[PDB]
Amino acid sequence: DDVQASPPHAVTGYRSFQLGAFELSRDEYFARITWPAKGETRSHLIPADIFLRAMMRDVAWGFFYGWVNFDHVIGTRNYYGKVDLYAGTFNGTLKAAGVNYTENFETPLIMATFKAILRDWTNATFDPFAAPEETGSAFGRKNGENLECIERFRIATKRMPGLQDDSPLRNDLPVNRQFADVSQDEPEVHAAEGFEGELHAFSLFKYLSRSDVTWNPSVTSVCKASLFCPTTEEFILPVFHGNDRVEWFIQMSDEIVWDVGDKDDGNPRARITMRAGDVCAMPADIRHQGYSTKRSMLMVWENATPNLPHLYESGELKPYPIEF
Amino acid sequence: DDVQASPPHAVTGYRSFQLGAFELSRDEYFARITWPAKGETRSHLIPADIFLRAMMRDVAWGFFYGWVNFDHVIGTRNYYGKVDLYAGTFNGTLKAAGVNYTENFETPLIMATFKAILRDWTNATFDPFAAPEETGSAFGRKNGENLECIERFRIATKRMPGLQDDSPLRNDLPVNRQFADVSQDEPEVHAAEGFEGELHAFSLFKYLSRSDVTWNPSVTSVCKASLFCPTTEEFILPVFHGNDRVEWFIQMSDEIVWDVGDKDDGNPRARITMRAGDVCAMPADIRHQGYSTKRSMLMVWENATPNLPHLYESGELKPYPIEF
Amino acid sequence: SNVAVNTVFASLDNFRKGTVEIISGEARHYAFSNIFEVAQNSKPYEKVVVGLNLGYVVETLRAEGQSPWFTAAHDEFAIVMDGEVRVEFLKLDAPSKHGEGTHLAGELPVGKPMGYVLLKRGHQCLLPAGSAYRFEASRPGVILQQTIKGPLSVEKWAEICLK
Amino acid sequence: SNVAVNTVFASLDNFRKGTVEIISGEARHYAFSNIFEVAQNSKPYEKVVVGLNLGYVVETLRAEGQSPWFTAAHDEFAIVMDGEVRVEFLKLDAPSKHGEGTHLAGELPVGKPMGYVLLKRGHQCLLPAGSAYRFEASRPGVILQQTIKGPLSVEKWAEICLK
Ligand SMILES: [Fe+3]
């Protein structure tokens, strides 16, 4: 939990960071990651915007499941309590050149470091969670902070938003410019006498219409291990995902396009287009990335059953959910 | 060469375009190419910003030499007189799946099509030749034009800029903000008595100091087929170039990083970092792309001999230039 | 020129199924279906299973007329995806405390009336454990129900998904 | 809190040669050298080939004191990458019509003075066809000569490039 960071660069303004072997520094346009392989120091450059957007999802999701790739070179892999940070290890050509490198870390330390890297590289002009059209540039020299955007406080949802001891509804937030025509009507709830506040319903669409973040599933209903985690998508999913378990999507408004390839070298497997009302299962043996022109309403359905990885490794569960 | 267009989109405002069997369209975020391969129509999306900068160069360059790749799927190969537009053909994995397509066009058709596309998709707020910090967003719905930017004019250098029949110097151009600190002092030209206007000289650092474009080799000295084409570089070279002959580079200021790879495998062949003074050759068997944090001065040294490509093709000439 | 925002929702009368483009492999591997194509081709309140995930299901109900009284031992949920749906609630005097899945509550459930909720499209409501709930639709609609596989859950994979 | 615009140029007394990190292949294929390095380790006005492309060459000369007399059958340019070089021109009455590459015009060429040019860092001039030019450098500096391979063109790849 003790973050090796440097002093602010003389010209640039930004701190550089150390994480095991990995060196992470940035300048006016690029983040730059450094690792050792074959006796020399290898480098890689990613546009600041791409980089921050991805790191933000990495932090927000707690490193998620499976493989989270910032791009064809850099990515992380959550082994729950421990996280791998890797460079090219899952890029065919680098693995084969012997130039790649991985290193494990305890979750609490890599988190402290990533959270730190964001606090320092996100200027007051940029919001890593937003679509491009919604926000300024990530480029240039260091210029203030944006704590408000990279440090969102949320109340965990226990059962459903809108209940008393639960997460709040969003009536106090603006409707997003791209959801400006979604009805803001709430369901009518007529409780019988002696039962006031014993029944609950809200407007999911009104809810998502007011989402200030992008590509961030958030929980709206819990059924034991079954979680509904709707999100609102705009532009390009900030990372490409190598799956670990089967995932399910229900497209609720508009459309998203999904690129789908082998988890390794990226042999195209499919290209999926989901229009309103479509239900799709993403296999556990592929990687995927989403494109969405208009801010759209997508429902991500998660299974929080803990022994899930055991099941997939045993063959108790096949790569794809259904034999028909 | 009669361009195949469509009426502007009822919402988007932009128009689509046919070209053989490639449909090319765009919406508020993405350009999209559509082609046939495998007995189905395949698609690919490129963020509108990436796509425009790339086409801008391909068009400005008369389709250049050899392979010009907009990104990992899309590009053009110039056969001087005819051009190939391809999807995936040059990407090894896409080819191996049989998802790729190439069509061959008469140079003036494709050119008239790309010119039309540039005209119609570049909003009045977007400069395709400019670096990100210097211009606005490619995104949104159709918003006016920007001919003052995609429709520039250069007097072809015949021998040297500054000569009475030749391309002009740039005294009527602001200095670029990242070059603010470069000397505007010209040379001293003391033409002997009875010889006024017979000696020719200028500041090449002032001339580039005033480059209004980015990643655009323009000629500043001819010597038979030997051309000097400096240019000012900033951010990421909009295409990744496939060489059909030997390019040579001489960095004159700051630095540039070059990701050099197999002309098909993408083989991390090398990662070359050039500082001020560095000179280096680009084999004809590799593709290259450059990374320039600060706006920089590069010299590209061309050879315009008309048969060169047959030589490397046939094998008569080795891909690297010198044996030692 | 055009500044009009148009968020696209489907309905039973007007839906366009998406597309799975295969490059290598099999479309069946993605269990791809549309909820609106499903409700359009199902009996009133047939709980069709569209997501199956380690025993947890997402069911699509076609809302038309009046439903059976339903119950379960655990919470479930409903999103009204199209239509207008009135949900009626009853606090059972003797709720199932065990088992899993949505079950038929009986013809004449025993308990005190808790009241009703009026759901239009986009609205979600809680179907609390140990209550019995009933659906009434004056206009054909689509209900998404989140729950666990049980007796009333119907699987017609071949019939609903691309192949 | 910093608007510092520093465009970096290199000198003879201060240069930072770049780097070629290979993944697969050989650094030799890149003919990678530095022009300030090559100048610091060469005789005054030794025409060192740092670029070669089918006969056409780029040359680097170390600027020091007076040059001989040079002349050729075609145009040729020079850039001053460092210091100050003064360039004196004479119009040959009887110049070479054939051949290529830069040639010595001798100790005492016969022609009418054209005057001179006074180049500084980053200036470029034309060394016209059928004229003979001469260099004179007060302090050490560097010259870049665009031309063709002649009998004065020196090739020492082995020494300048990486391997
Ligand atoms: Fe995933």
Side-chain angles (χ1 to χ4, degrees):
Chain A
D1 200 316
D2 220 10
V3 189
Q4 296 182 86
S6 82
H9 184 266
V11 187
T12 258
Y14 298 122
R15 310 183 178 274
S16 53
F17 293 82
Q18 257 268 156
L19 190 46
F22 283 102
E23 217 234 7
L24 302 92
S25 64
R26 87 92 130 194
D27 61 35
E28 290 92 313
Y29 280 102
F30 316 103
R32 189 259 200 120
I33 314 294
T34 273
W35 67 98
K38 286 191 323 173
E40 279 149 47
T41 282
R42 325 315 260 237
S43 295
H44 183 66
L45 296 167
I46 303 161
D49 55 327
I50 303 333
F51 188 93
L52 287 165
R53 294 212 207 87
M55 176 153 310
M56 183 70 241
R57 303 313 183 281
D58 222 10
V59 175
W61 303 345
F63 300 99
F64 208 25
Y65 38 92
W67 293 264
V68 188
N69 302 84
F70 297 39
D71 66 19
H72 57 279
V73 196
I74 297 318
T76 76
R77 213 299 195 215
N78 179 19
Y79 289 116
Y80 323 106
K82 274 153 177 293
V83 182
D84 276 18
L85 176 54
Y86 58 76
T89 294
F90 304 112
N91 165 288
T93 331
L94 302 232
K95 184 60 195 160
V99 120
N100 74 287
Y101 172 85
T102 302
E103 173 175 10
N104 203 269
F105 294 100
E106 309 275 13
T107 291
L109 160 62
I110 178 156
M111 179 66 69
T113 300
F114 278 24
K115 280 193 176 168
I117 293 168
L118 281 168
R119 191 186 193 110
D120 183 65
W121 303 357
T122 310
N123 300 324
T125 196
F126 183 69
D127 175 7
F129 252 129
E133 276 178 42
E134 319 200 86
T135 203
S137 161
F139 291 151
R141 319 271 193 91
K142 155 121 247 203
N143 188 308
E145 285 173 339
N146 209 161
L147 294 178
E148 298 299 321
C149 289
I150 68 175
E151 279 188 281
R152 317 242 197 205
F153 188 78
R154 298 146 193 172
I155 297 180
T157 295
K158 166 179 79 171
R159 210 181 180 198
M160 170 193 272
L163 284 59
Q164 218 55 6
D165 64 21
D166 224 292
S167 54
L169 295 186
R170 294 174 177 170
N171 179 66
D172 57 332
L173 295 161
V175 172
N176 194 279
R177 85 262 188 260
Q178 282 201 24
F179 281 133
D181 59 323
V182 172
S183 166
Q184 304 282 306
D185 295 355
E186 307 263 15
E188 269 162 45
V189 41
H190 306 271
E193 147 192 306
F195 289 103
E196 184 270 332
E198 282 296 305
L199 311 168
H200 315 267
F202 69 107
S203 163
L204 189 56
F205 290 7
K206 172 186 181 167
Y207 195 67
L208 295 166
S209 93
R210 290 162 188 247
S211 189
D212 49 11
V213 297
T214 239
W215 306 99
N216 202 41
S218 224
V219 153
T220 62
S221 55
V222 192
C223 182
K224 297 196 158 168
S226 162
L227 306 175
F228 263 0
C229 318
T231 179
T232 58
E233 317 307 35
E234 189 172 341
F235 193 47
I236 304 179
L237 159 65
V239 307
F240 73 73
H241 197 207
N243 276 7
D244 168 42
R245 71 203 49 210
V246 174
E247 272 147 41
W248 290 85
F249 296 148
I250 316 267
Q251 189 74 38
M252 294 184 305
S253 84
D254 300 297
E255 72 172 14
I256 304 188
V257 182
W258 287 102
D259 242 42
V260 179
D262 275 8
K263 206 149 51 175
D264 336 65
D265 40 30
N267 313 136
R269 294 300 301 289
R271 186 170 152 96
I272 309 198
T273 314
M274 297 191 62
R275 309 195 171 98
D278 285 328
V279 174
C280 181
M282 292 290 185
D285 65 348
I286 51 85
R287 57 183 243 186
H288 57 108
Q289 176 149 229
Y291 301 80
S292 171
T293 308
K294 167 191 184 319
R295 210 183 181 89
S296 72
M297 285 186 186
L298 159 85
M299 165 77 59
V300 176
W301 177 26
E302 271 171 42
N303 187 336
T305 277
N307 76 303
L308 232 35
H310 165 58
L311 294 182
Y312 287 110
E313 182 72 303
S314 334
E316 275 295 274
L317 286 179
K318 313 309 177 187
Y320 56 100
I322 298 166
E323 261 290 291
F324 69 91
Chain B
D1 62 84
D2 222 36
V3 165
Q4 283 216 74
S6 71
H9 199 271
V11 200
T12 268
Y14 308 110
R15 341 177 76 120
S16 90
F17 293 84
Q18 268 284 151
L19 184 53
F22 287 121
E23 244 213 354
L24 297 82
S25 57
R26 105 94 117 176
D27 54 47
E28 14 261 358
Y29 273 115
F30 306 112
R32 167 191 197 221
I33 330 283
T34 255
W35 73 87
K38 264 282 216 56
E40 275 209 35
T41 284
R42 349 296 304 205
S43 302
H44 184 55
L45 298 173
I46 306 177
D49 69 330
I50 301 295
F51 178 97
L52 287 181
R53 304 200 195 93
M55 172 163 294
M56 174 81 279
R57 304 295 188 302
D58 212 36
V59 169
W61 292 348
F63 289 114
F64 211 26
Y65 300 130
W67 309 51
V68 186
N69 301 86
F70 291 24
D71 74 348
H72 57 126
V73 185
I74 289 270
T76 77
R77 204 234 294 226
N78 191 1
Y79 289 126
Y80 325 84
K82 289 212 174 52
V83 173
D84 278 339
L85 175 48
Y86 57 75
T89 306
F90 147 128
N91 166 327
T93 307
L94 277 191
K95 188 165 64 60
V99 160
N100 74 282
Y101 180 86
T102 329
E103 182 157 15
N104 183 260
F105 309 96
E106 316 266 11
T107 318
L109 177 51
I110 173 157
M111 170 87 308
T113 289
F114 281 22
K115 283 200 148 158
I117 282 162
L118 271 173
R119 187 173 169 139
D120 185 61
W121 292 3
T122 314
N123 296 327
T125 179
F126 184 65
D127 193 358
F129 263 104
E133 269 181 347
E134 288 189 297
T135 203
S137 158
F139 299 147
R141 294 177 178 155
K142 169 95 208 217
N143 183 328
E145 307 176 334
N146 204 174
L147 302 162
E148 294 291 89
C149 291
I150 65 180
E151 233 202 12
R152 331 228 176 195
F153 223 97
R154 336 217 148 78
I155 298 293
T157 305
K158 179 205 101 266
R159 253 174 92 192
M160 178 170 318
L163 277 48
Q164 235 66 331
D165 58 276
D166 228 314
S167 52
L169 298 176
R170 288 157 178 177
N171 205 82
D172 71 284
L173 275 182
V175 158
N176 190 308
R177 75 278 186 262
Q178 284 195 21
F179 281 143
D181 67 318
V182 167
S183 177
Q184 304 299 311
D185 298 350
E186 299 276 27
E188 306 290 11
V189 48
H190 298 343
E193 356 284 18
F195 257 163
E196 163 197 327
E198 308 285 15
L199 304 186
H200 307 276
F202 62 103
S203 177
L204 191 63
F205 284 13
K206 160 180 184 160
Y207 184 90
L208 299 176
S209 163
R210 299 170 172 245
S211 199
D212 50 322
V213 290
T214 248
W215 299 101
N216 194 31
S218 165
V219 178
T220 62
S221 69
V222 177
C223 156
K224 299 201 178 182
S226 163
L227 319 185
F228 265 22
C229 325
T231 163
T232 49
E233 328 297 70
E234 177 185 353
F235 191 56
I236 299 148
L237 170 51
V239 306
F240 65 77
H241 187 195
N243 286 350
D244 78 332
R245 72 194 52 177
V246 190
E247 300 165 344
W248 280 78
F249 289 136
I250 330 229
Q251 190 67 16
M252 296 170 300
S253 68
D254 308 84
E255 51 165 5
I256 287 200
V257 182
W258 289 95
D259 244 22
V260 188
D262 265 11
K263 192 152 73 158
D264 236 73
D265 201 325
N267 243 39
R269 292 294 292 282
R271 186 185 159 85
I272 310 155
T273 309
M274 285 172 159
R275 304 220 184 54
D278 268 18
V279 171
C280 151
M282 294 286 164
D285 57 338
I286 61 93
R287 61 210 209 196
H288 54 269
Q289 183 180 227
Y291 295 67
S292 188
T293 296
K294 159 156 181 311
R295 201 172 187 98
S296 48
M297 286 164 191
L298 178 62
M299 174 78 53
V300 176
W301 175 43
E302 277 164 43
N303 183 3
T305 308
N307 89 283
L308 271 31
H310 156 84
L311 296 206
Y312 296 95
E313 267 287 348
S314 75
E316 228 234 324
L317 273 186
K318 274 171 159 51
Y320 45 95
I322 300 145
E323 258 300 328
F324 72 109
Chain C
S1 175
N2 208 226
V3 177
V5 172
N6 193 42
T7 287
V8 171
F9 301 115
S11 61
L12 271 153
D13 284 343
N14 195 26
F15 66 88
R16 185 150 130 87
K17 171 124 95 162
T19 53
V20 178
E21 170 200 341
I22 298 282
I23 305 187
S24 161
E26 295 189 76
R28 34 175 286 253
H29 291 152
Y30 305 87
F32 192 94
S33 75
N34 178 286
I35 53 170
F36 303 113
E37 176 183 288
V38 164
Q40 192 192 67
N41 300 177
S42 303
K43 319 159 177 52
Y45 304 102
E46 188 177 13
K47 295 177 119 61
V48 189
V49 158
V50 311
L52 183 57
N53 181 3
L54 197 69
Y56 299 90
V57 287
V58 166
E59 304 160 347
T60 291
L61 292 72
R62 168 192 173 96
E64 199 184 335
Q66 181 199 60
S67 84
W69 282 103
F70 285 125
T71 194
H74 55 91
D75 296 339
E76 300 154 280
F77 304 82
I79 331 274
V80 173
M81 278 285 103
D82 176 36
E84 227 254 286
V85 174
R86 158 193 175 105
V87 190
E88 224 185 4
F89 287 97
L90 250 185
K91 182 164 178 187
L92 294 180
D93 289 21
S96 19
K97 297 224 89 261
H98 306 296
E100 271 182 352
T102 153
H103 284 235
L104 287 167
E107 304 284 26
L108 299 159
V110 187
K112 324 179 174 256
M114 309 174 61
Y116 67 85
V117 167
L118 240 176
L119 303 167
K120 323 250 227 50
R121 151 266 248 175
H123 296 184
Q124 170 171 312
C125 89
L126 170 56
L127 308 184
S131 67
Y133 55 94
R134 189 164 62 166
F135 288 135
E136 313 212 336
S138 296
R139 52 174 273 192
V142 171
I143 288 181
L144 259 202
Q145 184 160 346
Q146 174 191 21
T147 185
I148 302 177
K149 200 231 267 306
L152 273 27
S153 289
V154 189
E155 305 188 62
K156 30 226 299 286
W157 297 104
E159 292 186 24
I160 67 169
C161 302
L162 306 183
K163 177 106 183 186
Chain D
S1 79
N2 204 323
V3 137
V5 171
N6 187 25
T7 300
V8 167
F9 301 109
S11 80
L12 257 160
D13 15 319
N14 192 9
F15 63 84
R16 246 301 181 268
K17 169 92 159 285
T19 95
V20 174
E21 93 162 6
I22 293 239
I23 277 36
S24 68
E26 342 214 359
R28 6 178 302 218
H29 289 178
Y30 300 109
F32 196 95
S33 47
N34 183 286
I35 70 175
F36 299 87
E37 200 179 58
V38 178
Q40 196 192 58
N41 298 151
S42 298
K43 310 182 179 60
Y45 299 94
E46 186 187 350
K47 308 184 86 78
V48 178
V49 167
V50 306
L52 173 76
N53 194 344
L54 275 6
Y56 307 90
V57 301
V58 173
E59 293 163 337
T60 303
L61 298 78
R62 170 177 173 88
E64 235 183 6
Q66 183 158 103
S67 173
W69 285 98
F70 293 116
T71 198
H74 40 69
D75 298 83
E76 285 167 66
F77 327 72
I79 316 247
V80 160
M81 287 295 138
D82 196 8
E84 270 162 76
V85 149
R86 189 209 67 113
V87 180
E88 146 160 303
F89 293 100
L90 282 277
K91 153 104 194 174
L92 285 201
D93 291 339
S96 31
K97 170 162 180 10
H98 295 51
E100 41 199 28
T102 154
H103 290 289
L104 297 161
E107 303 277 54
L108 294 165
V110 222
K112 347 157 80 296
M114 300 191 51
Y116 69 71
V117 190
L118 227 166
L119 311 179
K120 306 216 215 70
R121 175 181 72 187
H123 300 133
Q124 153 179 356
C125 109
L126 160 61
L127 323 170
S131 66
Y133 49 96
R134 170 219 256 168
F135 311 114
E136 201 158 6
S138 308
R139 22 239 139 69
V142 182
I143 292 172
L144 262 173
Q145 183 139 337
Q146 179 193 3
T147 182
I148 309 208
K149 182 185 178 45
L152 276 47
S153 283
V154 192
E155 286 190 10
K156 41 171 177 159
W157 304 109
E159 290 152 68
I160 45 170
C161 301
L162 299 163
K163 286 187 66 78

